[PDB]
Amino acid sequence: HKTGYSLNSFYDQKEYMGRCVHYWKKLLPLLDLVKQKKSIPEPVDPLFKHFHNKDIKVSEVKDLEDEACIAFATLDLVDGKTEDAIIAFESVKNVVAYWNLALIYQRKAEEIENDCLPAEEQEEFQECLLKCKGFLKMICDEYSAY
């Protein structure tokens, strides 16, 4: 995800984001079976078998799911399905979802409409309240964007 987004090449961003979406869409069914359940049985170590680290707690399932949903939304965003991309970004409530919403509002409203700018205002206000917690999770920190 990081290596793809870091690039500017369209034909490589699409591929890296699609394949990261692939790995997350295959991890989706495997992570749902954490309800006091055996993950996958492996007596032998196929290529990568460690323990007491590979096990994800019940807490982090939701977080990883939200990251996967952000990945889906970003895939649709780097394709051109502009509206359902925003639909997909309007589900998670971390900093990255808000930032992507605000950037797409910029892109779609460079000089287009005035009443859609209040969306940008409220999004940057939520980002202000979140930076009041000092979160540096954004790709380029708020010192430049906000």
Partner: protein, 126 residues
Amino acid sequence: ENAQNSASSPREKSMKGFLFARLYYEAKEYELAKRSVSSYISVQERDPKAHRFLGQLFEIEGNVEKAVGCYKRSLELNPTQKDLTLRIAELICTLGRAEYWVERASKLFPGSPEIYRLKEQLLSSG
């Protein structure tokens, strides 16, 4: 980003930036493509690439006047200018002022339906 850093390491500010310009050209970012193209032309003098980069940029920006200017400078450079007359004739069609360019296009390409129609429209505009 990463390509720009790898380039600034050697510090070329060059065909690397020209490839970024070509990527922005293949994509849809007129201002960034034009900026990178101008920066590359500044670093690599003149060539069909520099002229065609800028001419495609201006053609997509709609400034057919600036496109015709860049094409005229390119044809004055004259390494290989064959699309220059075609661009001039298209600018004439989009445009008395088209009469000279249509006569030139017709004298450089006798079997020219589009240019002959442009000439007729210019003589109509007894």
